Structures are given as structure tokens and as C-alpha cells.
Amino acid sequence: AAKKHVPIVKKRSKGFMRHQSDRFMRVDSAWRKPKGIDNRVRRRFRGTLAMPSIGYGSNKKTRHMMPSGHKAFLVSNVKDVELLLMHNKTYAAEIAHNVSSRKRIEIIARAKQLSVKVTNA
RNA sequence: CGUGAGCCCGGGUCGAACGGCCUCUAGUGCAGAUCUUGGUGGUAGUAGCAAAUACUUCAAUGAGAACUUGAAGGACCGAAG
Ligand SMILES: [Mg+2]
Ligand SMILES: [Mg+2]
Ligand SMILES: [Mg+2]
Ligand SMILES: [Mg+2]
Ligand SMILES: [Mg+2]
Ligand SMILES: [Mg+2]
Ligand SMILES: [Mg+2]
Ligand SMILES: [Mg+2]
């Protein structure tokens, strides 16, 4: 599986956290752009957090590829996993939650016949 | 996984509903407003519990007695009490 691709180079493997999200408990860790008039992060002072922008974008050839080389497709049926019959070299099944224990077995059983990778077997 | 808002999965709890996609709709996104309501801290076992002179012994009750009771002693209000 995972036919062939250029090496998956990630320009930044960390992520962006909100300014002062570590000091205050009311401030979530999800990124929000600092819009204050005196904010040091927004003014890009040396030694502060970085802001998300294009330029950190991933290569288009490897944009949504997991490290194996597949792209994740959410599957919740035996009929849904059969959509990847022709794309088993580029897409990998990912059994969503809410799928009962019995239906999970059938999806694993069928995706094995199709030689489709399952990311949460 | 995505530059990002976010999305997805595994593990634990739980017990009755829920989601994707295309359109339509809105009381639709919070860190502040000496914001509103509710809850909780440090301070902190901290400030303090110091006016009106004052209590002590024995016994009983009782799981437990300085401020319950009886007896004895010592005091105060001192009749515009
Ligand atoms: Mg019920
Ligand atoms: Mg509103
Ligand atoms: Mg809110
Ligand atoms: Mg708030
Ligand atoms: Mg306030
Ligand atoms: Mg004290
Ligand atoms: Mg005092
Ligand atoms: Mg008189």
C-alpha cells in the first residue's frame, strides 16, 4: 500500500497556541489572532510566539497524507468501505466511533478482502 | 490531519438519542464592559472573641461538665436597684 510519493516534509511540527493561554485558565489553547493595539505577538517582536500564515502550508502532493502515505476516509458501513475498492493505494479506511462492536468486525472483515488499510483496527 | 478556526480516532465514565452532505433560517462564536447571576480562593487557622470588680471546693446527673443541679465558702446590684 501507499503507492509512491515525495518525502513528507512538515515545515512546522508543533502548532500554534493562543497568546497567554498558559497563564490564564479562561483563555483556551486554540489559536486566536492578537488584535490588540500594543500586542507584542501581533507586532512580531523577537522572542515571542509565531503567528499562522501561508508559507507554513504543506506540499500539495503530500498535504493530507498520514505518515504511511494514505489519506483518511471516515467509514461507518460495509457499503461505505467498498467505495475505496479502487483507491486502496491512496485512501485508508477509518472506522468512525458510534459503530457497534459487531459492525466493526464486519468492516474489518470486508476491508481485509479489499486489501484496504484500516487505521483503527 | 489542517498554516489556522477546527476535524477525526484510541482508552475511561454514561444510559437514549444523534450525525454527514446540498439548500433555507437565526435570539449563531467572548478575556475584559468598577459587565450580570451562581460558585470558589489567597489573605488565614489570621484579625479577633479584652466595658458592666469574681469566682472556688465537694457530690449527683451524664459518653462527655468553667458556664447543669444541690450544699458550703467568697462577692456584686445597694431601694432614681
Ligand atoms: Mg432512561
Ligand atoms: Mg446574542
Ligand atoms: Mg459563553
Ligand atoms: Mg467569561
Ligand atoms: Mg469584575
Ligand atoms: Mg489570634
Ligand atoms: Mg476588643
Ligand atoms: Mg422616686
Side-chain angles (χ1 to χ4, degrees):
Chain A
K3 50 160 194 176
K4 182 62 65 68
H5 53 90
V6 287
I8 303 182
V9 164
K10 303 198 166 316
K11 286 164 166 174
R12 158 152 177 151
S13 78
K14 187 197 274 218
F16 301 79
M17 66 182 180
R18 201 176 158 175
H19 186 36
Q20 293 181 338
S21 69
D22 47 298
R23 294 179 66 188
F24 299 93
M25 294 182 286
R26 56 173 178 270
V27 169
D28 56 10
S29 179
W31 166 257
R32 302 262 177 288
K33 186 176 175 66
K35 300 177 205 63
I37 63 174
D38 288 336
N39 198 309
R40 62 181 56 249
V41 168
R42 180 197 77 72
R43 288 155 75 180
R44 296 199 202 102
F45 267 106
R46 172 186 57 159
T48 44
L49 305 164
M51 313 201 277
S53 61
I54 49 156
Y56 287 104
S58 294
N59 199 340
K60 293 187 286 185
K61 288 174 169 107
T62 67
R63 185 158 278 166
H64 288 269
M65 293 177 70
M66 65 183 73
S68 81
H70 298 72
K71 299 193 189 245
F73 183 67
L74 210 57
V75 173
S76 66
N77 296 115
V78 293
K79 298 293 183 182
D80 288 332
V81 76
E82 281 150 2
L83 292 160
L84 279 43
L85 166 77
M86 308 285 318
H87 303 90
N88 62 329
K89 297 296 289 183
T90 61
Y91 281 83
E94 184 178 1
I95 311 163
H97 73 282
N98 298 318
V99 180
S100 59
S101 53
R102 292 173 301 171
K103 257 191 188 155
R104 279 193 74 106
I105 301 299
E106 306 303 321
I107 296 168
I108 301 299
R110 180 97 190 111
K112 177 56 166 325
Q113 291 170 352
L114 275 67
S115 66
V116 165
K117 177 196 171 168
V118 181
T119 57
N120 47 334

